[PDB]
Amino acid sequence: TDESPLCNQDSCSHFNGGCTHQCMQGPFGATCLCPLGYQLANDTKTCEDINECDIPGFCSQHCVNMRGSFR
């Protein structure tokens, strides 16, 4: 209750605490926090595009996937 499985990453400054995307820190250290349309990878210091229409029925008909959005 004073710690987490992730601990003592730097604050969101030194190469964003190692994050390659949008980022902040709680008292435990920095993480990425991906914008709308993106997800956190395993590493929690990088973000990946969601394939928003690999999900069946997200688009009623023809779909294309693009970085951070869909058409």
Q: Is the Cβ of residue 20 or residue 51 nearer to Ca ion in the bound state? A: 51
Q: Is the Cβ of residue 11 or residue 65 nearer to Ca ion in the bound state? A: 65
Is there binding between residue 22 and Ca ion (CB under 5 A)? no
Q: What CA–CA distance (Å, rounded) separates 15 from 69?
A: 26
- String of b and e for 46-56 (b: at least 16 CB within 10 Å)? ebeebebeeee
Is there binding between residue 49 and Ca ion (CB under 5 A)? yes
Is there binding between residue 10 and Ca ion (CB under 5 A)? no
Residue in the structure block whose two tokens are 């229409």 = 53
For Ca ion, the binding residues (CB under 5 A) are 49, 65
